[PDB]
Every structure is written in structure tokens, then in C-alpha cells.
Coordinates of C-alpha atoms and ligand atoms in Angstrom, one line a residue:
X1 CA 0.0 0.0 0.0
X2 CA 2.9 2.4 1.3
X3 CA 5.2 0.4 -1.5
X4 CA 2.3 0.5 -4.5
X5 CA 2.3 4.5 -3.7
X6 CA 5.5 4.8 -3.9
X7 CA 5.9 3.2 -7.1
X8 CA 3.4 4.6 -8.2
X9 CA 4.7 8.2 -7.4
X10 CA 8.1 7.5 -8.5
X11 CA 6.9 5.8 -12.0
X12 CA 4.7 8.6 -12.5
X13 CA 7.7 11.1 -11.9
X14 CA 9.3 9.2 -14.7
X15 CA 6.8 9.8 -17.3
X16 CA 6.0 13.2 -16.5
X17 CA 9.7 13.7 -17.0
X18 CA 10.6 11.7 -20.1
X19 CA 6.9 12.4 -21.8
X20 CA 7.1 15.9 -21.3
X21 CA 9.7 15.9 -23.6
X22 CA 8.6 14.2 -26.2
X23 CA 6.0 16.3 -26.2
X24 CA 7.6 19.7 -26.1
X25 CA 9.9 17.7 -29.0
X26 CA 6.6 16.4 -31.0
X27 CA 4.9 20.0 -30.8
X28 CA 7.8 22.1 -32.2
X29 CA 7.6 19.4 -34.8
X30 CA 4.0 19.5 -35.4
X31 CA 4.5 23.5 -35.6
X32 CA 7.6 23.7 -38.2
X33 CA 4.8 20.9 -40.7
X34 CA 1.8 23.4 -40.6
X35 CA 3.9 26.2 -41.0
X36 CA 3.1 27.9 -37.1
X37 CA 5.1 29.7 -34.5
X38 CA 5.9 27.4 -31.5
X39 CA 3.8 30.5 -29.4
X40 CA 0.7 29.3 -31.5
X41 CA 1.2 25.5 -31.2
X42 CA 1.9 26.2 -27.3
X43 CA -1.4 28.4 -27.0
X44 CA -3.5 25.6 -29.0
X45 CA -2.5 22.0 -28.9
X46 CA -0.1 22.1 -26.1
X47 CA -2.5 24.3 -23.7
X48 CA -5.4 22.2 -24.2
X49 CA -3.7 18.9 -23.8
X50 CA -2.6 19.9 -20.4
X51 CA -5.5 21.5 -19.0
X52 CA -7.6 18.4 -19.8
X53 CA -7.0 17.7 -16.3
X54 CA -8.5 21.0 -15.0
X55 CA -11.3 21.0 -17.1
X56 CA -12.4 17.2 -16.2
X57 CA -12.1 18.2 -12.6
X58 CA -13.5 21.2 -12.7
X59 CA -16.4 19.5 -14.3
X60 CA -17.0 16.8 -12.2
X61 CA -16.4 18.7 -8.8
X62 CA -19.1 21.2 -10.0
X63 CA -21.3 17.8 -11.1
X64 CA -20.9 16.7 -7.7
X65 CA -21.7 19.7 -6.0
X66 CA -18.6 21.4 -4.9
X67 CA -18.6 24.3 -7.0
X68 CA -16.0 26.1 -4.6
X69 CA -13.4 23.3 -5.8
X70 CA -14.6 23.7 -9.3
X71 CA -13.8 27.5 -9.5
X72 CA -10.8 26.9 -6.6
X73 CA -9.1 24.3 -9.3
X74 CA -9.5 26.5 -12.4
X75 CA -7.9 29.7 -10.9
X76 CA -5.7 28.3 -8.7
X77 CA -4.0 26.7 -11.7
X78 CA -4.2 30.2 -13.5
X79 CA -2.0 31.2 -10.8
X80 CA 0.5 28.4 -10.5
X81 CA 1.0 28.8 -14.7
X82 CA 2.0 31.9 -14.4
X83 CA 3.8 32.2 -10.3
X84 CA 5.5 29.1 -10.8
X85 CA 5.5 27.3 -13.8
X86 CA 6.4 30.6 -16.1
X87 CA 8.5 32.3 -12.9
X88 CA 10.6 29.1 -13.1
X89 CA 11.3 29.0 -17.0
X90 CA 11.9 32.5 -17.5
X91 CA 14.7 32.1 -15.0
X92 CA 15.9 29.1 -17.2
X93 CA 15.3 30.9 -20.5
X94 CA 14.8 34.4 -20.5
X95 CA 12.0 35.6 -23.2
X96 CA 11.4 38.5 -25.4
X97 CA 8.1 38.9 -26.5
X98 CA 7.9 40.2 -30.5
X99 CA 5.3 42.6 -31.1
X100 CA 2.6 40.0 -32.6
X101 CA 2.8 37.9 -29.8
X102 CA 2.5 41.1 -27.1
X103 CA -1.2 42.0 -28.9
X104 CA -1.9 37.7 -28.4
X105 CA -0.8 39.0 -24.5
X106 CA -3.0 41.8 -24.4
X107 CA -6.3 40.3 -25.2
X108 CA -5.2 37.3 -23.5
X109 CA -5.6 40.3 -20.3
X110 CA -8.8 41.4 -21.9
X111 CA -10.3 38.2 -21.3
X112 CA -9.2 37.7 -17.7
X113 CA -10.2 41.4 -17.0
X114 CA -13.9 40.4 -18.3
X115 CA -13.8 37.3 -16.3
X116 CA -13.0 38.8 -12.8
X117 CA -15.5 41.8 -13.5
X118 CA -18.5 39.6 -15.1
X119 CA -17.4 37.0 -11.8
X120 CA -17.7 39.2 -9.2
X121 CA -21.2 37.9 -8.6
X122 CA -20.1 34.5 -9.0
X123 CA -20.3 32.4 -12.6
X124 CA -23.3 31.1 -13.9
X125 CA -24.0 29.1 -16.7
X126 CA -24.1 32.3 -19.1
X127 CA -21.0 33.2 -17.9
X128 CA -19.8 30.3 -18.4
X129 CA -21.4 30.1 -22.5
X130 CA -19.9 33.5 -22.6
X131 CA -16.7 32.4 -21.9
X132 CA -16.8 29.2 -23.6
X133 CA -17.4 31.1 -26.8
X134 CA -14.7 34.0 -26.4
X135 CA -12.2 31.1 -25.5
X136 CA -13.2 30.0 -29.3
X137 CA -12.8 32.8 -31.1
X138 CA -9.3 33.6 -29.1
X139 CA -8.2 29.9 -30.4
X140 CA -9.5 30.4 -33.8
X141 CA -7.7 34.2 -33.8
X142 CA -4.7 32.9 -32.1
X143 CA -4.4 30.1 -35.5
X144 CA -5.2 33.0 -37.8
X145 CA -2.7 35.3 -36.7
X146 CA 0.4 33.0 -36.2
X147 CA -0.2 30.7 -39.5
X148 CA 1.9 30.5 -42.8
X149 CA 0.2 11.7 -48.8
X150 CA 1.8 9.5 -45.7
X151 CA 5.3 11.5 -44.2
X152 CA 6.8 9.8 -42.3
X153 CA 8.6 13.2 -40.7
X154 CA 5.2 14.2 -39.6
X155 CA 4.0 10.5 -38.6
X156 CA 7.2 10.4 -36.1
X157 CA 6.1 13.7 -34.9
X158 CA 2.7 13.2 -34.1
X159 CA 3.7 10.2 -32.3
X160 CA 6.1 12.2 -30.0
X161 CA 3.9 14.4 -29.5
X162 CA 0.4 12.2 -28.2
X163 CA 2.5 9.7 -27.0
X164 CA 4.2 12.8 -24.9
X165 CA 0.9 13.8 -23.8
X166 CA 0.0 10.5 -22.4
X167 CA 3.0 10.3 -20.9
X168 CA 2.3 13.6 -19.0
X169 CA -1.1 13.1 -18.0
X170 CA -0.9 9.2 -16.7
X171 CA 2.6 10.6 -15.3
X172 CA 0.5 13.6 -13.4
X173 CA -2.4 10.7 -12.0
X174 CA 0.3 8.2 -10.8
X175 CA 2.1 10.9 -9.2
X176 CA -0.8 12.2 -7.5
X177 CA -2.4 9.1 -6.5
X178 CA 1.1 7.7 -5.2
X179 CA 1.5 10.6 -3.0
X180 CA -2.4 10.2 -2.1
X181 CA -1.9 6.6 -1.1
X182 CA 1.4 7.3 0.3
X183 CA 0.3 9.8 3.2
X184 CA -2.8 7.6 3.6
X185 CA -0.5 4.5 4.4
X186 CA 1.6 6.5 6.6
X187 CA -1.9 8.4 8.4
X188 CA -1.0 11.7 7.6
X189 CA -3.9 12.4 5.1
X190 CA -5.5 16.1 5.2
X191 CA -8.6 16.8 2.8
X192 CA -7.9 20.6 3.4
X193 CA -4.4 20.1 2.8
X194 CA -5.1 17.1 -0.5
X195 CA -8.1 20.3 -1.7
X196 CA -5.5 22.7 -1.4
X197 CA -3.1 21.3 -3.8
X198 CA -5.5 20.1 -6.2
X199 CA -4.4 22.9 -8.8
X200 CA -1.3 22.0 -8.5
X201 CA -1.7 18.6 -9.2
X202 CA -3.4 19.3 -12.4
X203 CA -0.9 21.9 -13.2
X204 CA 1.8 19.4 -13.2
X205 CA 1.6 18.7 -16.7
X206 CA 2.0 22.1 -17.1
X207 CA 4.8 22.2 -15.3
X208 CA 6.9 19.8 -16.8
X209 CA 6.0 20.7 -20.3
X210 CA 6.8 24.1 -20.1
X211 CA 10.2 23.6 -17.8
X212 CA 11.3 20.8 -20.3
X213 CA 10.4 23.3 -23.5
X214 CA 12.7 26.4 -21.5
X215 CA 15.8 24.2 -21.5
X216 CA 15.2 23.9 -24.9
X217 CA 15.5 27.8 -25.2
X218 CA 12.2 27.3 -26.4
X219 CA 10.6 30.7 -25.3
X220 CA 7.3 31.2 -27.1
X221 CA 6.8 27.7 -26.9
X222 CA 6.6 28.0 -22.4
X223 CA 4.2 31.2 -23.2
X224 CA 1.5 30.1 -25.2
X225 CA 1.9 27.2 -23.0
X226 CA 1.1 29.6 -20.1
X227 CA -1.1 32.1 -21.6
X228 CA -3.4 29.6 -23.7
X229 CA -3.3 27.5 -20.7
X230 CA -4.6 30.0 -18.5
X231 CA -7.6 30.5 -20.7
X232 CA -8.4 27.1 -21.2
X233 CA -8.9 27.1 -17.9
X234 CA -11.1 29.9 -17.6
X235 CA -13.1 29.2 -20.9
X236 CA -12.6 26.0 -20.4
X237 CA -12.2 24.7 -16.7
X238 CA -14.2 27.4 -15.2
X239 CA -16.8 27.3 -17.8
X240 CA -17.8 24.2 -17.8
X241 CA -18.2 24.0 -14.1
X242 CA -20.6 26.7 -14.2
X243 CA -22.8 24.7 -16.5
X244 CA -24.0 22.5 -13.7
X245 CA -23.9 25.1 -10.9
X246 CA -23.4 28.5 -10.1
X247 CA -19.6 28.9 -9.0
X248 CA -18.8 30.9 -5.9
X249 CA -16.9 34.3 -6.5
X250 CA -13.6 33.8 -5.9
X251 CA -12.8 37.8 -6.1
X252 CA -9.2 37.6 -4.1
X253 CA -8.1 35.2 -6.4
X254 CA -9.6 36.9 -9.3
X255 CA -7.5 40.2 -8.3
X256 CA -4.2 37.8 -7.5
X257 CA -4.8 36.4 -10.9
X258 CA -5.4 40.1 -12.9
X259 CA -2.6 41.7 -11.1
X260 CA -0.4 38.8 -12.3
X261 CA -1.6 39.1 -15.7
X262 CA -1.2 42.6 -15.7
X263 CA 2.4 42.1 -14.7
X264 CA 3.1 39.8 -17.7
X265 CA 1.8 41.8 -20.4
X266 CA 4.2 45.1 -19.2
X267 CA 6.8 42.8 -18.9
X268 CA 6.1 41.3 -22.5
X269 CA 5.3 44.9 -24.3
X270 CA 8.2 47.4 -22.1
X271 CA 11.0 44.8 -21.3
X272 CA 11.2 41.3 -21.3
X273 CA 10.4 38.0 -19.6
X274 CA 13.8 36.9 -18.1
X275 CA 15.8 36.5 -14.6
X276 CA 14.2 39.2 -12.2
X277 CA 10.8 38.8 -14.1
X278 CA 10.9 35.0 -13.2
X279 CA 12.2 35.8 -9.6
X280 CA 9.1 38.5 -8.8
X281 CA 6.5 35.8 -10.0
X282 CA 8.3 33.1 -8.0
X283 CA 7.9 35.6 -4.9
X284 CA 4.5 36.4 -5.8
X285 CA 3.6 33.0 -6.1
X286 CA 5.2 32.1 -2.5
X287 CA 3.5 34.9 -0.9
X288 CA -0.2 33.8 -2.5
X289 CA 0.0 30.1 -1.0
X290 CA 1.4 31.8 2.2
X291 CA -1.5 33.7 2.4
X292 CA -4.5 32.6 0.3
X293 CA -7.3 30.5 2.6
X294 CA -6.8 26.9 2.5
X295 CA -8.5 24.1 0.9
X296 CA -9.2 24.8 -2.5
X297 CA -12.0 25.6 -2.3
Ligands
OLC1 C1 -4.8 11.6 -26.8 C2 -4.4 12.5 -25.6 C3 -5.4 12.6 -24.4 C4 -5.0 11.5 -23.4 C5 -6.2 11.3 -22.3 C6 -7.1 12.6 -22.1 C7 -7.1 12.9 -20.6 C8 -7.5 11.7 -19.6 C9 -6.8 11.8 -18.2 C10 -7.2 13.1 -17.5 C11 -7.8 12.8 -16.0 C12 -8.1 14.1 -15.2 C13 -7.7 14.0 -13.8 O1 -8.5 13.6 -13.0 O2 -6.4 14.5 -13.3 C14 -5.3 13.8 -13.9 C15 -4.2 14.8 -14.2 O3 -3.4 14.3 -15.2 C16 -3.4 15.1 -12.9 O4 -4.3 15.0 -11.8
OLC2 C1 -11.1 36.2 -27.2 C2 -11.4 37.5 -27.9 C3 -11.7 38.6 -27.0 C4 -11.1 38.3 -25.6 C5 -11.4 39.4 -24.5 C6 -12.2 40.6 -25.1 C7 -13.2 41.2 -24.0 C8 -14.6 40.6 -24.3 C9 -15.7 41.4 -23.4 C10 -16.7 42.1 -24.3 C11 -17.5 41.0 -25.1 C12 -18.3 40.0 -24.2 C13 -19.3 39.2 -25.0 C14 -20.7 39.9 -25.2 C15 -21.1 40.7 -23.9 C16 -21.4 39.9 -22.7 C17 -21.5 40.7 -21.4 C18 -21.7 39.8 -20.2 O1 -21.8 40.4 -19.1 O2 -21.9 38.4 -20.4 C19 -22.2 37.6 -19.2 C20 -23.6 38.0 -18.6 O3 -23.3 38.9 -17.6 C21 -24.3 36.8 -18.0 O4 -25.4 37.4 -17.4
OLC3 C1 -13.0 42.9 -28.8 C2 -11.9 43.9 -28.5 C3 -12.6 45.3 -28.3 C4 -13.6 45.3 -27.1 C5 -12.8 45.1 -25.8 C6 -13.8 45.1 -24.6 C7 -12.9 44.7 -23.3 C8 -13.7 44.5 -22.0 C9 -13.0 43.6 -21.0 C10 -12.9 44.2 -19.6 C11 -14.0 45.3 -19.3 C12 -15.2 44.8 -18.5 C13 -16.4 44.3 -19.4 C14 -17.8 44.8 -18.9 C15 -18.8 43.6 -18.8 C16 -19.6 43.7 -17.5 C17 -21.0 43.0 -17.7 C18 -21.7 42.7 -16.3 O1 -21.6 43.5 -15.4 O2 -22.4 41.5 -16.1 C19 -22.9 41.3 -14.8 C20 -23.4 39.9 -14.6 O3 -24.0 39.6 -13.4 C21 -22.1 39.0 -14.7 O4 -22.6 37.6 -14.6
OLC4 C1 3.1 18.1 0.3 C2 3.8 17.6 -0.8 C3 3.1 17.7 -2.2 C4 3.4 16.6 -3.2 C5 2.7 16.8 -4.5 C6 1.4 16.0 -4.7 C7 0.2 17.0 -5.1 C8 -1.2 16.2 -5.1 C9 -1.6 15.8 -3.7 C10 -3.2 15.9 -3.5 C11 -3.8 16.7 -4.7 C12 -5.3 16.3 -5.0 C13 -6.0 15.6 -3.7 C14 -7.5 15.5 -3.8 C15 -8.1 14.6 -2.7 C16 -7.5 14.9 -1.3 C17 -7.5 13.7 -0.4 C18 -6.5 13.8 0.8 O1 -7.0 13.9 1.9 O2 -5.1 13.9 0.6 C19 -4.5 14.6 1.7 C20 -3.0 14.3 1.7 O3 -2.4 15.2 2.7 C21 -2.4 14.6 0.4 O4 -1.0 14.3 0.5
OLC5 C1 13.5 14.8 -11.9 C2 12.2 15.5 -11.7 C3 12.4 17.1 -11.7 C4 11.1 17.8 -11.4 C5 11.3 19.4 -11.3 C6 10.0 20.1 -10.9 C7 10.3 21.4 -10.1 C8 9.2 21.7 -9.0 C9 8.8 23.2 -8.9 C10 7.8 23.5 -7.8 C11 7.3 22.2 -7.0 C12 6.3 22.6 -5.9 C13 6.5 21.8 -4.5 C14 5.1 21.5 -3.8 C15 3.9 21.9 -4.7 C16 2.7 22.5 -3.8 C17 2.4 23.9 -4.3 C18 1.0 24.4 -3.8 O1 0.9 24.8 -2.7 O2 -0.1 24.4 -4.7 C19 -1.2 25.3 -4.4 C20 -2.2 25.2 -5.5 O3 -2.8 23.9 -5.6 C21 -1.4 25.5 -6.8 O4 -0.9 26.8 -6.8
MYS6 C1 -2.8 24.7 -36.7 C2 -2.4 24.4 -35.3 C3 -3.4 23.6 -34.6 C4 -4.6 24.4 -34.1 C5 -5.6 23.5 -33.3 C6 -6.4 24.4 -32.4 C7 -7.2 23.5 -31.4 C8 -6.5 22.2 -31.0 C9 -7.3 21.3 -30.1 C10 -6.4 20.5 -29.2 C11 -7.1 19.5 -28.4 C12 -6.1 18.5 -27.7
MYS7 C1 -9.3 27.4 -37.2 C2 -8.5 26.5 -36.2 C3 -9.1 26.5 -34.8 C4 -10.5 26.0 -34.8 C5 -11.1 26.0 -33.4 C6 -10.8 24.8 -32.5 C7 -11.7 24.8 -31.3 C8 -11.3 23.7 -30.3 C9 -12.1 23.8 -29.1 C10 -11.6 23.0 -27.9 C11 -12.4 23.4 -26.6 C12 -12.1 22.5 -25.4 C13 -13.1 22.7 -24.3 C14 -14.5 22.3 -24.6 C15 -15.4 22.6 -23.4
MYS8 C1 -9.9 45.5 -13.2 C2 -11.1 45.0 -12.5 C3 -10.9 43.5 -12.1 C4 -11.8 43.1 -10.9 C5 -11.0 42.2 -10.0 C6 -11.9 41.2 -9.3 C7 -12.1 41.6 -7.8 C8 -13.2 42.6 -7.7 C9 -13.0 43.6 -6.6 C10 -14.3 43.8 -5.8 C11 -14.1 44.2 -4.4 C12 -15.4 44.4 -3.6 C13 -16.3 43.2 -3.6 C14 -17.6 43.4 -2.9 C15 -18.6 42.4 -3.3
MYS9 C1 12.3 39.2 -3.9 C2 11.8 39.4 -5.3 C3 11.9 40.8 -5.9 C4 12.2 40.8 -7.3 C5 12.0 42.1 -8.0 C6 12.1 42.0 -9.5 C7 11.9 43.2 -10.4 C8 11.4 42.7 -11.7 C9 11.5 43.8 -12.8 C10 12.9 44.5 -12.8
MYS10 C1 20.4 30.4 -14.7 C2 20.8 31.0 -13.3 C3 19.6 31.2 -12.5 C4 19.8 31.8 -11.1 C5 18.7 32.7 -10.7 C6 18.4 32.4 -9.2 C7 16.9 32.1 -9.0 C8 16.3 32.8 -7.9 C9 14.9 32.4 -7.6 C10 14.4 33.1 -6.3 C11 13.0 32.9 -6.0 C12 12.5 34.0 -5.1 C13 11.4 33.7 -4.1 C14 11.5 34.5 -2.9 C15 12.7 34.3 -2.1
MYS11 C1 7.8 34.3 1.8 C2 7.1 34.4 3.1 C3 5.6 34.8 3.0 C4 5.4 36.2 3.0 C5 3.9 36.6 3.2 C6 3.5 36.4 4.6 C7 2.0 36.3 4.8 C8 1.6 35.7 6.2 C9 0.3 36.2 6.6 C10 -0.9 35.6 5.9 C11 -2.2 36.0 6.4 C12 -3.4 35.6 5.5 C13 -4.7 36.0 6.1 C14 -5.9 35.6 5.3
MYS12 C1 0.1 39.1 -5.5 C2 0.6 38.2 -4.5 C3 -0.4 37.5 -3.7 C4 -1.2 38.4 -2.7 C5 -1.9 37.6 -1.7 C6 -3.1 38.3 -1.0 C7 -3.9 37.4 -0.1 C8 -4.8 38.1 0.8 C9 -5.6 37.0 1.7 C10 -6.3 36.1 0.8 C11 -7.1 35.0 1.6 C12 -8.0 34.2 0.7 C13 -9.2 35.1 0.3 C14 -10.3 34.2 -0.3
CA13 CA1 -21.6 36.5 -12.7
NA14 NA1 -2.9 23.5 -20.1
NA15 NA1 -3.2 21.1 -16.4
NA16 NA1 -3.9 23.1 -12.5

């Protein structure tokens, strides 16, 4: 019980380490055949893929009537993209942001800007719809703006790249339900405490994808990772929660989340997303789970 956790968390370290690469690997791939920046196959494929997690969660929590996990799980990983997982790999690979992909940052704010104010009340299901359908057009946009028989260069790379994704996201389950059967064998389980890290354990695909893509140098890649994961989340995760029940405002988090958004678009359009960028999210991100009520939700 102890020993199945533990091999279960340690296999499931193993393939979120050696399946986020082939992702990251089968992506840029993928992006260089259809003739897209890695920012665009980051934003699309990539940030989908990943939040899968978050927006099955986020969905069943809300079908099972915890909407405060629901909404706690889709912003809390908003957070953790950008405090940690995009504080981390700017330190690794520092990032500036080209002037197409700064206007894919600003409405990127736009749309989390609408969220907090339209959430302020709570989400309900037309929020939700509302969302659902501006998440569409930003995908569809995003494609637009960043775009121009059997190969078996693009056959190899698709395989990377969906075997890569099931490596990450069976690598994320094992790793969370060996460390869930772990402190269970050992009698140290805590629902606040396992609620409160719930983000983070969907996040960890995230994670992994976007630290293995920075020490590739692979810059754009880690943000539309981040920013198209972020609003998967929201018109995604978020969204779809709020179809089966009105979601709680969440309007600290909302304001932790805009502030770091706003943060990352200056950074993007006046400097760039490098060392002391990476170290301020880092901080920010220490101080929000320092102070930010427990549980998740
Ligand atoms: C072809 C590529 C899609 C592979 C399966 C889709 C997602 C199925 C697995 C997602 C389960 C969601 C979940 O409960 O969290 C797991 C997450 O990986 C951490 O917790
Ligand atoms: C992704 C492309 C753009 C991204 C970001 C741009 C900002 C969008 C906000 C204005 C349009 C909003 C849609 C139409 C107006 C809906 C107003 C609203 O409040 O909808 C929810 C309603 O409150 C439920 O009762
Ligand atoms: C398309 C690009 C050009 C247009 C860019 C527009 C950007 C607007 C985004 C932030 C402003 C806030 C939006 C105002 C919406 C508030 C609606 C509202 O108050 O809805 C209450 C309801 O109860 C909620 O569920
Ligand atoms: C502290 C070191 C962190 C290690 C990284 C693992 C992150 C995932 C752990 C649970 C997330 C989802 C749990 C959802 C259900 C909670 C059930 C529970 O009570 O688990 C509590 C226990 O303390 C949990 O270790
Ligand atoms: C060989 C394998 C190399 C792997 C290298 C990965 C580097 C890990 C970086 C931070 C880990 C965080 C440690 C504990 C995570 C809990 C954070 C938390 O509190 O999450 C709250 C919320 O759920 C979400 O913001
Ligand atoms: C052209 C690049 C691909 C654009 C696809 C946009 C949506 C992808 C859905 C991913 C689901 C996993
Ligand atoms: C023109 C290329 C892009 C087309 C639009 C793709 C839409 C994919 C939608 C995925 C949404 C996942 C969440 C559903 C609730
Ligand atoms: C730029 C506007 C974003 C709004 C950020 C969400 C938080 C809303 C602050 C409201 C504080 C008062 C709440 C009383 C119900
Ligand atoms: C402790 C963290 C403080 C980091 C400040 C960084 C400034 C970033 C822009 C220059
Ligand atoms: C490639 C060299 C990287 C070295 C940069 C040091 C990383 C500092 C991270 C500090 C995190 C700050 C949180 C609050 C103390
Ligand atoms: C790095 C150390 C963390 C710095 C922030 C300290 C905050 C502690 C007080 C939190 C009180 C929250 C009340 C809701
Ligand atoms: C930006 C860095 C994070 C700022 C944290 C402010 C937290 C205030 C207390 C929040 C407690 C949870 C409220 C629901
Ligand atoms: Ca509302
Ligand atoms: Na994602
Ligand atoms: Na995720
Ligand atoms: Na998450």
C-alpha cells in the first residue's frame, strides 16, 4: 500500500519527465509541418492537452456539488501557470516577446479582466457560455494570426507528440495518487491540505511541459503554454463547471490572478520575460500560497 504508492509516485515522476519531452519535441515538430510559430502550437495543442486535467475536474467537482473546488481548481491553476511554472522557465530561458505575440498577451488580459468583473457575482452558466465562446474565437484568432500523402517526418512527430501527452497526463495521475496513497499508508492524510493542492496537481503537466520546453531555449513555446493554458482554464475549466452550478466568487483570487496578468503583459510589451521577471513571479507566487485561505475551495 505504502510500497504501491511509492511506485506509483516515482513511475509517475518518470513519465512526466521523459513524456514531457517528447511532447515539447513532437509539438515544435507538429509546428515547423503546418507552417506555425511554437507560441501558436503552445497556445492551441499544447494548452489544451494539459488542462484536460483542470477542465475534467472542474467538471465533475461542479457535477458533484462542490462548485468552490470547481472555481478553486480552475484559478488556482491560473496562478500556478504563471507564479510558478512561467517564474521558473523565464529564470531558465529568459524571453522576449515580439510585437505580434505582445497584442496575443493583451487580449489574453482582456479576457481575464472580463472574467474577474462579469465574476464578481459569481459564474453562472451564461458566464460560463460566454466564456466558452470567447475562449473559441481567441483559439480560432490565435491560429489565424500565427499561421503560414503518408510523411513519415510528420508521422514520427505526431507520435512524440500524443505519446508525450500521455506520458504527462498518466505521469501527473500516478504521481498524484502515489502521493495520495502514500500519506494515507503513513496516516498523515488532510482533505484541506489534498483540496488545497488540487491545482497543483493538475498543473503538473503544465509544469513539466513548459520547464522541459525552457531548457530547450524554447521561449514562445513556455508562453503560449502559459497564456493559452490559462484561458483554457477559464473558458474551459471554469466554464464548464458553471454549467452545472453557479460557481462561488472567488474575487481575491480573481485580483491575484489580474494583477499577475497585468504584470506579464508590461513585462512582455516594455521589457522582457527573463531572470528578475521569473524571480518576482516566483515571490509572488510564494506569498499567495502563504497567504490565500486553505483548501481549494
Ligand atoms: C490523446 C491525448 C489525451 C489522453 C487522455 C485525455 C485525458 C485523460 C486523463 C485526465 C484525467 C483528469 C484528472 O483527474 O487529473 C489527472 C491529471 O493528469 C493530474 O491529476
Ligand atoms: C477572445 C477574444 C476577446 C477576448 C477578450 C475581449 C473582451 C470581451 C468582453 C466584451 C464582449 C463580451 C461578450 C458579449 C457581452 C457579454 C456581457 C456579459 O456580461 O456576459 C455575461 C452576462 O453577464 C451573463 O449574465
Ligand atoms: C474585442 C476587442 C474590443 C472590445 C474590448 C472590450 C474589453 C472589456 C474587458 C474588460 C472590461 C469589463 C467588461 C464589462 C462587462 C460587464 C457586464 C456585467 O456587469 O455582467 C454582470 C453579470 O451579473 C455577470 O454575470
Ligand atoms: C506536500 C507535498 C506535495 C506533493 C505533490 C502532490 C500533489 C497532489 C496531492 C493531492 C492533490 C489532490 C488531492 C484531492 C483529494 C485529497 C485527499 C486527501 O485527503 O489527501 C491529503 C494528503 O495530505 C495529500 O498528500
Ligand atoms: C527529476 C524531476 C524534476 C522535477 C522538477 C520540478 C520542479 C518543481 C517546482 C515546484 C514544486 C512545488 C512543490 C510543492 C507543490 C505545492 C504547491 C502548492 O501549494 O499548490 C497550491 C495550488 O494547488 C497551486 O498553486
Ligand atoms: C494549426 C495548429 C493547430 C490548431 C488547433 C487548435 C485547437 C487544437 C485542439 C487541441 C485538443 C487537444
Ligand atoms: C481554425 C483553427 C481553430 C479551430 C477552433 C478549434 C476549437 C477547439 C475547441 C476546444 C475546446 C475544449 C473545451 C471544450 C469545453
Ligand atoms: C480591473 C477589475 C478587475 C476586478 C477584480 C476582481 C475583484 C473585484 C473587486 C471587488 C471588491 C469588492 C467586492 C464586494 C462584493
Ligand atoms: C524578492 C523578489 C523581488 C524581485 C523584483 C524583480 C523586479 C522585476 C523587474 C525588474
Ligand atoms: C540560470 C541561473 C539562474 C539563477 C537565478 C536564481 C533564481 C532565484 C529564484 C528566487 C525565488 C525568489 C522567491 C522568494 C525568495
Ligand atoms: C515568503 C514568506 C511569505 C510572505 C507573506 C507572509 C504572509 C503571512 C500572513 C498571511 C495571512 C493571511 C490571512 C488571510
Ligand atoms: C500578488 C501576491 C499575492 C497576494 C496575496 C493576498 C492574499 C490576501 C488574503 C487572501 C485570503 C483568501 C481570500 C479568499
Ligand atoms: Ca456572474
Ligand atoms: Na494547459
Ligand atoms: Na493542467
Ligand atoms: Na492546475
Amino acid at each position: 500500500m505504502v510500497i504501491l504508492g511509492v511506485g506509483y509516485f516515482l513511475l509517475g515522476l518518470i513519465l512526466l519527465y521523459y513524456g514531457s519531452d517528447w511532447f515539447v519535441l513532437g509539438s515544435e515538430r507538429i509546428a515547423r509541418h503546418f507552417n506555425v510559430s511554437n507560441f501558436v502550437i503552445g497556445a492551441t495543442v499544447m494548452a489544451i492537452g494539459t488542462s484536460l486535467p483542470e477542465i475534467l475536474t472542474s467538471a465533475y467537482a461542479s457535477y458533484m456539488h462542490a462548485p468552490g473546488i470547481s472555481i478553486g481548481n480552475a484559478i488556482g491553476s491560473c496562478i500556478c501557470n504563471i507564479g510558478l511554472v512561467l517564474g521558473l522557465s523565464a529564470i531558465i530561458s529568459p524571453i522576449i516577446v515580439d510585437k505580434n505575440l505582445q497584442k496575443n498577451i493583451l487580449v489574453y488580459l482582456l479576457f481575464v479582466i472580463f472574467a474577474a468583473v462579469i465574476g464578481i457575482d459569481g459564474f453562472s452558466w451564461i458566464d460560463g457560455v460566454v466564456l466558452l465562446i470567447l475562449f473559441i474565437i481567441y483559439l480560432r484568432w490565435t491560429v489565424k494570426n500565427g499561421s503560414a500523402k503518408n510523411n513519415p517526418s510528420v508521422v514520427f512527430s505526431l507520435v512524440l507528440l500524443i505519446i508525450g501527452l500521455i506520458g504527462v497526463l498518466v505521469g501527473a495521475e500516478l504521481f498524484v495518487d502515489g502521493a495520495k496513497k502514500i500519506a494515507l499508508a503513513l496516516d498523515i492524510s488532510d482533505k484541506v491540505i489534498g483540496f488545497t493542492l488540487v491545482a497543483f496537481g493538475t498543473s503538473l503537466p503544465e509544469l513539466m511541459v513548459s520547464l522541459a520546453a525552457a531548457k530547450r531555449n524554447l521561449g514562445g513555446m513556455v508562453l503560449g503554454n502559459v497564456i493559452g493554458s490559462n484561458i483554457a482554464d477559464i473558458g474551459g475549466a471554469l466554464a464548464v463547471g458553471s454549467l452545472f452550478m453557479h460557481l462561488p466568487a472567488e474575487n481575491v483570487q480573481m485580483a491575484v490572478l489580474v494583477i499577475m496578468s497585468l504584470l506579464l503583459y508590461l513585462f512582455a510589451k516594455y521589457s522582457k520575460i527573463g531572470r528578475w521577471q521569473g524571480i518576482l513571479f516566483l515571490a509572488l507566487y510564494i506569498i499567495a500560497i502563504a497567504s490565500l485561505r486553505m483548501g481549494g475551495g
